[PDB]
């Protein structure tokens, strides 16, 4: 059943945030999903397979909200404003989605299938930006977004939206 | 106080964090990884939180020495841009072990004020390093770019060429 699988997937993601990768178990995910422990075994082969599916699902939802910023963009100047919106909004409120995303970078370096998921996510992001930028610039821009977003977590001095826009437009070239 | 031994315990704490994650690290496991008697743990560190703090702190110092070393030969902005490129292209910053330790630190920083304090200090060091050649705003942009590019470099199915990276670094540098 599609809906219970998805609840298990979401429970898995929330579980990673609360407990960390090593500490996650079937019992914790089942309690978090409100499902019988016996059903964790049905929908997935192992805890590892589950985590992989759940990280995959997570990147798909990152991409959907990524494009969301760009649904109204029709050219490169508009894209620089959107990218600026995205970075600025991260600054003013740290999205709850990034320590999960840094975990994934580390994990990808030891887990090839996760690396495959991550490359797939990156290509999605590139493809979005490539609507308005040549491929190299698109790669630069997406790197700058992720870098700035992380930077905000532990940065004390504030950056204004305009300062961010000026940086984004320098990268866009 | 025995400096050498404390430092082996610090290092062992970092090895343990990689192996078991932060919520599994114990004095006994550090003790065996460090090759020191268990009583050395009590003599050097109050609790596990203190030890983790000092270990992650030491970790950021190692990263900082490394970061600095890329600019050893640098005396002007284009040389710094070449240095930043090397730093990205070398895949020496974002190794599997460093990325995993950086995850752990980012996470704990969200949950424990003191580790956030350790991270901000680390970031200030990187910024000061770059402000030798660049304006404070540009320094900040470059450091953010380095963070994103290094992660993309080791992950990308086909990463950017070195000259492409240089070209982009030079854009950010303005």
UniProtKB/Swiss-Prot annotation, chain B:
Q: Supply the induction statement.
A: Autoregulated.
Keyword set, alphabetical order: DNA-binding, Transcription, Transcription regulation
Tell me the GO molecular function terms: DNA binding; DNA-binding transcription factor activity
- This protein's source sits in the domain of life called Bacteria
The keyword DNA-binding belongs to this UniProt entry's keyword annotation:
yes
Q: Where is the HTH tetR-type domain?
A: 3-63
Which Gene Ontology BP annotations are present? DNA-templated transcription; positive regulation of DNA-templated transcription
Q: What else is known?
A: Has a strong cooperative DNA-binding mode, leading to aggregation of RcdA-DNA complexes.
Q: What does this protein do?
A: Regulates the expression of a number of genes involved in biofilm formation and stress response. Target genes include six stress-response transcriptional regulators: csgD, which is a master regulator of biofilm formation, appY, sxy, ycgF, fimB and rcdA itself. This indicates that a large number of genes must be regulated indirectly via these transcriptional regulators. Acts by binding to the upstream region of its target genes.
Q: Which PANTHER family match?
A: HTH-TYPE TRANSCRIPTIONAL REPRESSOR NEMR, TRANSCRIPTIONAL REGULATORY PROTEIN
User: Could you tell me what this protein is called?
Assistant: HTH-type transcriptional regulator RcdA
Q: Gene of origin?
A: rcdA
């Amino acid at each position: 059943d599609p809906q219970r699988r998805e609840k298990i997937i979401q429970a898995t993601l929330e579980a990673v945030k609360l407990y960390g990768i090593h500490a996650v178990t079937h019992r914790k995910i089942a309690t978090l999903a409100g499902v019988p422990l016996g059903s964790m075994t049905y929908y997935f082969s192992g805890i590892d397979e589950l985590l992989l599916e759940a990280f995959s699902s997570f990147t798909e939802i990152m991409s959907r909200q990524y494009q969301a910023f760009f649904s109204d963009v029709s050219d490169a100047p508009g894209a620089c404003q959107a990218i600026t919106d995205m970075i600025y909004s991260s600054q003013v409120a740290t999205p709850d989605n990034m320590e999960l995303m840094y975990q994934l970078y580390a994990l990808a370096s030891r887990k090839p299938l996760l690396k495959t998921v991550m490359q797939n996510w990156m290509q999605r992001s590139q493809q979005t930006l490539e609507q308005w930028f040549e491929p190299g610039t698109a790669r630069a821009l997406d790197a700058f977004i992720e870098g700035m977003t992380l930077h905000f977590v532990t940065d004390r001095k504030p950056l204004s939206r305009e300062e961010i826009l000026r940086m984004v437009e320098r990268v866009a070239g």
